[PDB]
Amino acid sequence: ATKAVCVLKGDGPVQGIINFEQKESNGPVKVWGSIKGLTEGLHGFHVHEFGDNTAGCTSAGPHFNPLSRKHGGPKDEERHVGDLGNVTADKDGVADVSIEDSVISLSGDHCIIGRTLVVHEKADD
Numbered sequence: 001a002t003k004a005v006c007v008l009k010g011d012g013p014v015q016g017i018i019n020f021e022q023k024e025s026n027g028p029v030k031v032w033g034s035i036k037g038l039t040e041g042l043h044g045f046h047v048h049e050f051g052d053n054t055a056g057c058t059s060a061g062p063h064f065n066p067l068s069r070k071h072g073g074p075k076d077e078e079r080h081v082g083d084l085g086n087v088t089a090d091k092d093g094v095a096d097v098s099i100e101d102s103v104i105s106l107s108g109d110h111c112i113i114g115r116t117l118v119v120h121e122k123a124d125d
Helices: 016-023 029-031 034-039 043-047 099-108 116-117
Strands: none
Touching: 029 034, 034 043
């Protein structure tokens, strides 16, 4: 046809359908199932392993420069050993910010306070 029914040559037949039959066959098909199922499950949970395979050959392998950022940029470099919240927040907090508070509380709350509190428990002695 072309104009025997309704400008068949001017209704985006090969052009309008080219993007409509291509976008409606990949968009709501892969963008709403693949990237969240096929590419997310086979390439997002299998290949990518929800990260980088195993952070051994695609994140922490033999290379000091994977992609001038290390996938995303941060992490595994800053929050992995920042030396101010990753090796102290869970360490010093108990091996530097607790021992001193305990070594003084043990003899400062069991000899002066715990003494009377356990001796009479009245208030003082």
